Amino acid sequence: KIEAIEKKQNNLLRAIEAQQHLLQLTVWGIKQLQARILAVEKKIE
Structure with missing residues (x-):
C-alpha cells in the first residue's frame, strides 16, 4: 500500500x-509556424 x-x-x-x-x-513548434505564417502574410501584403 x-x-x-x-x-x-x-x-x-x-x-x-x-x-x-x-x-x-x-511551444517552440508554434513559434516556428507563427514566424512562417507571418512572412507569408507580409509577402502577399
Missing part, C-alpha cells in the same frame, strides 16, 4: 517531466 503509493508516485513524476518537455517542444 504505502509501497504501491510510492511506486506509482515515482512514475507520475517521470510522466510529468516527460510532458513538460513535450510541451516546450510544441
Whole structure:
C-alpha cells in the first residue's frame, strides 16, 4: 500500500517531466509556424 503509493508516485513524476518537455517542444513548434505564417502574410501584403 504505502509501497504501491510510492511506486506509482515515482512514475507520475517521470510522466510529468516527460510532458513538460513535450510541451516546450510544441511551444517552440508554434513559434516556428507563427514566424512562417507571418512572412507569408507580409509577402502577399
